[PDB]
Amino acid sequence: TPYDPLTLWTTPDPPPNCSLIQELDAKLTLCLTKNGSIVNGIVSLVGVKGNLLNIQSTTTTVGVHLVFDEQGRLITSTPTALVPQASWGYRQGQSVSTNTVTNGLGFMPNVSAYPRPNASEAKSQMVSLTYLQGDTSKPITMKVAFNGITSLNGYSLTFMWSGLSNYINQPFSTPSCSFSYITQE
Amino acid sequence: TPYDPLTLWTTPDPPPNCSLIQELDAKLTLCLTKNGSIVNGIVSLVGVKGNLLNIQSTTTTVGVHLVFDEQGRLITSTPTALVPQASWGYRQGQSVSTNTVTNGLGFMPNVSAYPRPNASEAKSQMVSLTYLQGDTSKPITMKVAFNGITSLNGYSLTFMWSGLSNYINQPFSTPSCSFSYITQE
Amino acid sequence: TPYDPLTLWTTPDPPPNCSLIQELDAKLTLCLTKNGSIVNGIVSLVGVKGNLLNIQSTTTTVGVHLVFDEQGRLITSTPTALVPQASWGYRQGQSVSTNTVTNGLGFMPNVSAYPRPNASEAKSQMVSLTYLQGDTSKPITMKVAFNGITSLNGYSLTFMWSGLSNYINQPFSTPSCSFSYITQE
């Protein structure tokens, strides 16, 4: 079965794939679909190691950066959460095609609408209230910023879940969380 | 084709079509639209009979499940909310098509991404903070769960609204609630 | 076909196109993408002149209306926030096409789902918690009402950010906010 050019993801159930604090200490599920000038996306993050399994007082916020180049290609180089060997790309069945992204701009956040320097402007963010573990008694905040950590010629997505301190010695895991944005192309 | 193979709804303004506590006590308006690997969803529930008109001290939550067979076809028997006489199929103008769903899996929550056993797992859930009757002064939580009330080959969607206990004798009407999930196929 | 007949926006980085409190005192960024029976929209508003830079103790709500006609076309007169000169049409490159919208209704809110004499009805409203300036400590709400200010034959989209009164002397800015709804056609 062919791959889907409107869909980039990390596969429905990735093995640990992000080294946020320690090696492969988090399991990141990310699906980005292109719906015309808008990409509808869903993300989830569950800790499997260290502080992610047991939030410390310093684990105030958990975040993941995904840096893209001028053509919208993910750069595994740090600060990119995804390890340079984890699967990321076009959906193909329950897996990821080996074809390189040739329509990445259609997946990158529009710089005109979201400038590379203006990573602090309100509009370069979509903010929501969600719950830790899915429990309505453990609220936290998910900030998603665009082009907030680029490279003069590239793109990015950042995910920040704040308000954790209140939940020390508790596993960090978010529900399936949605977000959307205007595409560069 | 006279219909939209990419949409399955209950029609825009359906009559009572659910029996949550007593027979036909609620109107469910549901639209599921597929775009690649994701389904955008909008749901709305308006109580019309019994406890749904007047919330009781013990009425703490209000939910509706929807179970599907191994081919994404809705099974209209408990615990499914929508009754046998209810409209449900692909959009065709303002009505539903009588054609059977040949692409049901395309609208089902991914079992790999949302396991049958792991229903309590934060990932199998999209939760938020919505408001009763669309009143910002009356916040209530909503939790959409994927595949937590299935039957080995089946699939399901579950909508739970809680924190209602503090609105005794008020009518139960939710605002239009958005949601989404990674599809099976 | 250079433009995209599935997107209706105001281009990504538009000049002040709103005169909410005083002339051209606010920039409104709006993108509506059609994905079958549902539309995925992203709203964004920032104040640049007058009271919008300093929230008053009585200013609990700040908002804009967009009124369309029988064919889903924008009426640049009151109550429509967007001034006559403001860019608005099909996305073409980073600008807008000159082609008159020939399918406005596919972007309009379904009147059967969202009735005119029912703007108050919970269903005719999608509500969420968001944050002023995108500051996770400055929560507020956004209400998107469907067909609440029309012309019997018209359609509309009303966005109202509230819970601002307790932020006096602060510049009004909102993050990019998501919303969606069932289409007429």
UniProtKB/Swiss-Prot annotation, chains A, B, C:
Places the protein is found: Virion; Host nucleus
Stretches of the chain forming a coiled coil according to its record: none
Factors inducing expression: Expressed in the late phase of the viral replicative cycle.
Miscellaneous comment in the UniProt entry for this protein: All late proteins expressed from the major late promoter are produced by alternative splicing and alternative polyadenylation of the same gene giving rise to non-overlapping ORFs. A leader sequence is present in the N-terminus of all these mRNAs and is recognized by the viral shutoff protein to provide expression although conventional translation via ribosome scanning from the cap has been shut off in the host cell.
Domain writeup: The tail region anchors the fiber to penton base capsomers, whereas the shaft, built from several repeated motifs, allows the knob to protrude from the virion.
Quaternary structure and partners: Homotrimer. Interacts with host receptor CXCAR. Interacts (via N-terminal tail region) with pentons.
Family: Belongs to the adenoviridae fiber family.
Purpose: Forms spikes that protrude from each vertex of the icosahedral capsid. Interacts with host receptor CXCAR to provide virion initial attachment to target cell. Fiber proteins are shed during virus entry, when virus is still at the cell surface.
Protein name: Fiber protein
Organism listed in the record: Human adenovirus A serotype 12 (HAdV-12)
